[PDB]
Design a protein around this ligand. Sequence first.
Ligand code: C5P
Length: 201
Amino acid sequence: GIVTIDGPSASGKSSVARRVAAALGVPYLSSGLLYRAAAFLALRAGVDPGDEEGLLALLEGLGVRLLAQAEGNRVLADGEDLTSFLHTPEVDRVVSAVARLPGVRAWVNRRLKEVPPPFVAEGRDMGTAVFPEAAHKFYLTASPEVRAWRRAPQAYEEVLRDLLRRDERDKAQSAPAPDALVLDTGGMTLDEVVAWVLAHI
Ligand SMILES: Nc1ccn([C@@H]2O[C@H](COP(=O)(O)O)[C@@H](O)[C@H]2O)c(=O)n1
């Protein structure tokens, strides 16, 4: 089955998912590799990383695959393993701009939905429901003050104002899925949240 870990910004959802997967001996689906793959393919093909229709045609055309493995995921394009090229400074430079294109996000989400279970992943991509039928859903919540507090401490004021905007922006998603098990992480360490999650699976 699929285990999903969701929550607001700076909720520690990714760190938790990575530990949960590691403990279960399953892969953790980190979206970053696919966005990097998209950037890489764009730069290699001479396709402007700002040209969405051109990039999408290229990505869909090549047939991209996320090989999920407990020891580390791989990304293949037309059967070629590109994984070792995804963290260079040229890819780093344009990857964010690429990830801001809505059609690329949808492409990434479709690549995520093709991976055969089991694995741990984030159930949502902002307002998009990526793994709505996962057998084990968990929602990690905490006050913006505690999330900001941990994120920083004088900077607390700044970090907080940022988190509050994202919370304001992401109002509709500031709630768990109907069948999600909720955990307030206030007063708990990373290891404690991980333990709590594993204990409810
Ligand atoms: N959930 C995610 C994960 C990564 N990304 C994009 O991919 C990049 C991070 O890739 P990594 O996580 O592998 O470092 C970020 O710059 C971000 O723009 C994203 O937009 N949404």
